[PDB]
Amino acid sequence: IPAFHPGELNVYSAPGDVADVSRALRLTGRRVMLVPTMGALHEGHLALVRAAKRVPGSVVVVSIFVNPMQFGAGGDLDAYPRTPDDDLAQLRAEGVEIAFTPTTAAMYPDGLRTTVQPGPLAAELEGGPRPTHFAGVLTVVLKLLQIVRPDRVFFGEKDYQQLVLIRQLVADFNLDVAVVGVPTVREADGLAMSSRNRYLDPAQRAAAVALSAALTAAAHAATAGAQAALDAARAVLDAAPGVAVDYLELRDIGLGPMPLNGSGRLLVAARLGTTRLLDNIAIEIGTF
Amino acid sequence: MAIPAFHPGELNVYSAPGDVADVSRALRLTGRRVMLVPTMGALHEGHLALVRAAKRVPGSVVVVSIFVNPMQPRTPDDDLAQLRAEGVEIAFTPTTAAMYPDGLRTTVQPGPLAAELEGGPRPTHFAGVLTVVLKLLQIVRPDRVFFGEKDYQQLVLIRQLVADFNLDVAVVGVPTVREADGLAMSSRNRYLDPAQRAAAVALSAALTAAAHAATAGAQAALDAARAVLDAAPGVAVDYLELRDIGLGPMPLNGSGRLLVAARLGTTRLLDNIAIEIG
Ligand SMILES: COc1ccc2c(c1)cc(C(=O)NS(=O)(=O)c1ccc(C)cn1)n2CC(=O)O
Ligand SMILES: COc1ccc2c(c1)cc(C(=O)NS(=O)(=O)c1ccc(C)cn1)n2CC(=O)O
Ligand SMILES: COc1ccc2c(c1)cc(C(=O)NS(=O)(=O)c1ccc(C)cn1)n2CC(=O)O
């Protein structure tokens, strides 16, 4: 197996290297935590790391890999933010002991061949206009899970549909990992942290507060019912300059084929210029 | 918190995925090497060859799963009696509901090989197989998993599954058990009437003739196989293909595999063989 220096940041690119180190660590009683990311790390990612660090006897593995298979033609893959130096600097500051930074060739030596086919949820919301997006996400997450074999894996709640689908992956394939969702870290005004907030100009940044404002307004309006919650959120979004709403939907918490009962999730996606922002919030109807 | 009961040297039967997972993990922690032999019950000498192969790994515990995948005949007490006779210590016998508690949802999509050969008549067959095999591997977490070479395309797809999803299991292909005249063992053989059973030997006879003709080249090999199949009545050949060992195009020289499938009455039979072209 390769070298592992505790208390320091060990960076591996070969899947076999991280697999060997992970398995060796687990066999000595350390529990392995995975935080899989596409890099361009921000305090929200750091919240995931800190959650992982809190598990007694944990060793934390952070993966950074911009996965080509969840993008389609149109420039999105090339445009994805890449800040490798800041990423690794942040991991050192947080006391992370393992970064896993695979090459595209190491992950996809045979190109696209066997893949994960998600359930019907993948064709809705974010997946509506992007039919293969979630198949790309679930395929890479499955791979990272098999390479690293963590005890627990950590995701932010901002991409809530992705998190739900990942829970479906884990249940449906009987994966022996616990999925931990971490509540969304926010800027002071309430804006959900995102690696894509950097693409908001000052005017768009100002207007972007409307998403979180709309969601929180709805969460409080919800004592008066679903229609009131939805209309409160719509009013706020409508009052906001240059916010073009793509959807605003209130669903059951698992987003699945069942109606809303008392507990729901309200999800929003909107464009500000060319920048697509997402946010979501827990909703209790009538209310709790 | 307690591990389900496991009595070493006896046949331990578990229908709950969580139970087999817990026992396999406990065994793994005590040093035993976990071997998995997936089956659909109605065990025959082929399945016993897989068991025996698994058994000879030192420190092995053998898990035989018995599950009829609706996504891709049963003798419950006889199957278990057979496994007991082979010294198998774990049988995993889940229900459809236990394997699919949330119904059909996330599944495995095979690569384009699944559309070829057997994927012609059954375009979704291999997605079913790969899905259940993945689940079985995740429930049991064996060090090694054993499959017959009879369903060679299936075997190749499994190796692709393991490679593509970075699974930490060793895939072991076990040579096809055959009847005395060479007919590959299969649950379907008993349906053949005497004329069909006699005609069915043409599959293995064709492939072995090809394997030996191969010193004279690829074309001689294929022509020899075709001639033998052409000598049999009521054998409707669906395909006869020479491929490389991973089922891509056959290279000009080197190792390959010759695969055949044919219908005799309503029974579809398959066979395949190693071929070397120098
Ligand atoms: C509803 O409109 C569409 C339009 C195009 C679509 C689909 C649906 C579904 C596929 C598809 O499953 N392609 S794939 O098997 O090659 C593949 C690609 C990428 C990843 C991650 C997983 N699997 N495709 C693309 C296609 O057919 O070529
Ligand atoms: C706990 O506070 C938060 C708050 C916001 C967060 C996170 C944590 C983590 C992400 C994030 O992105 N993670 S990811 O690198 O695995 C990824 C990348 C791309 C796509 C499609 C989905 N997921 N984010 C949101 C963000 O950057 O937009
Ligand atoms: C080492 O030599 C051999 C020789 C022949 C073999 C095997 C091994 C394994 C099988 C086999 O398929 N097992 S199965 O659990 O996938 C199955 C059983 C019954 C039905 C109906 C469908 N699927 N067979 C052939 C066979 O039974 O058809």
The answer to whether the beta carbons of residues A148 and A100 sit under 8 Å apart is: yes
| Same domain assignment for residues B185 and B161 | no
Number of domains in chain B: 2
Q: Edge-to-edge strand order for the sheet containing A243-252?
A: A243-252, A263-272, A275-284
**Number of CB atoms found within 10 A of residue B29's CB:** 10
**Number of CB atoms found within 10 A of residue A27's CB:** 9
| Same domain assignment for residues A127 and A205 | no
Experimental method: X-ray
Residue B272 to residue B150: CA distance in whole angstroms: 7
| Same domain assignment for residues B21 and B131 | yes
CA-based nearest distance A201→chain B, Å:
39
Which residue, of B128, B157, B175, is where some domain finishes? Answer: B175
| Same domain assignment for residues A170 and A215 | no
| Same domain assignment for residues A29 and A121 | yes
| Same domain assignment for residues B230 and B154 | no
| Same domain assignment for residues A225 and A203 | yes
| Same domain assignment for residues A167 and A240 | no
Nearest CA to ligand 3 atom 22: B40
| Same domain assignment for residues B28 and B125 | yes
Question: Which one-letter DSSP state was computed for residue B58?
Answer: T
Which residue, of A120, A155, A183, is where some domain finishes? Answer: A183
CATH number, residue B207? 3.30.1300.10
Q: Edge-to-edge strand order for the sheet containing A10-12?
A: A10-12, A98-100, A58-64, A31-37, A152-156, A178-182
A10-15: list long-range contacts, CB under 8 Å, 24+ apart: A10/A97, A10/A98, A10/A99, A11/A88, A11/A98, A11/A99, A11/A101, A12/A98, A12/A99, A12/A100, A12/A101, A13/A100, A13/A101, A13/A102, A13/A103, A13/A106, A14/A102, A14/A106, A15/A102, A15/A106, A15/A107, A15/A147, A15/B166
**Number of CB atoms found within 10 A of residue B147's CB:** 21
CATH number, residue B2? 3.40.50.620
| Same domain assignment for residues B196 and B275 | yes
- Give the three-class secondary structure for A267: strand
Question: Does B47 qualify as catalytic in the annotation?
Answer: yes
| Same domain assignment for residues B220 and B245 | yes
Residue A269 to residue B252: CA distance in whole angstroms: 55
Residue B88 has φ and ψ, to the nearest 5°, of -70, 130
Residue A81 to residue A69: CA distance in whole angstroms: 16
Are B105 and A119 a contacting pair at CB < 8 A?
A: yes
| Same domain assignment for residues A127 and A197 | no
Which residue, of B175, B205, B225, is where some domain finishes? Answer: B175
Q: Edge-to-edge strand order for the sheet containing B12-14?
A: B12-14, B90-92, B60-66, B33-39, B144-148, B170-174
Domain that holds residue A210: 184-288
Residue B142 to residue B25: CA distance in whole angstroms: 9
Element (H, E) at B277: strand B267-277
Helices in chain B by DSSP H: which ranges? 17-29, 45-55, 76-85, 96-99, 125-140, 152-164, 194-213, 218-230
Task: Provide the resolution (angstroms).
Answer: 1.7
Residue B252 has φ and ψ, to the nearest 5°, of -50, -40
Task: Report the residue of chain B nearest A142, measured CA to CA.
Answer: B165
Beta bridge partners, B204, equal: none
Using a CB–CB cut-off of 8 Å, the residues of A that contact B are: 15, 19, 110, 112-120, 135, 138, 142-143, 146-147, 149, 165, 168-169, 171-176
